[PDB]
Amino acid sequence: FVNQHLCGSHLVEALYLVCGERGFFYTP
């Protein structure tokens, strides 16, 4: 539902910050 979608948007911004030069995959 909508809250999961919105949550995912925050998650990816956080992964971008934490993962640094490693980067990441986002597989829902």
Partner 1 sequence: GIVEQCCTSICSLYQLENYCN
Do the beta carbons of residue 12 and residue 26 sit within 8 Å? yes
Residues 9 and 28: their CA atoms lie apart, in Å, by 11
Residues 13 and 15: their CA atoms lie apart, in Å, by 6
Task: Among 4, 5, 10, 25, indicate the residue that binds ligand Cc1cccc(O)c1 (CB under 6 A).
Answer: 10
Q: Is 24 in the site for partner 1 (CB under 8 A)?
A: yes
Q: Is 27 in the site for partner 1 (CB under 8 A)?
A: yes
Residue 1 partner contact from partner 1, a copy of itself, ligand Cc1cccc(O)c1, none using kind-dependent CB cut-offs of 5 to 8 Å: none
Task: Among 1, 2, 4, 7, indicate the residue that binds ligand Cc1cccc(O)c1 (CB under 6 A).
Answer: 7
Residues 20 and 2: their CA atoms lie apart, in Å, by 28
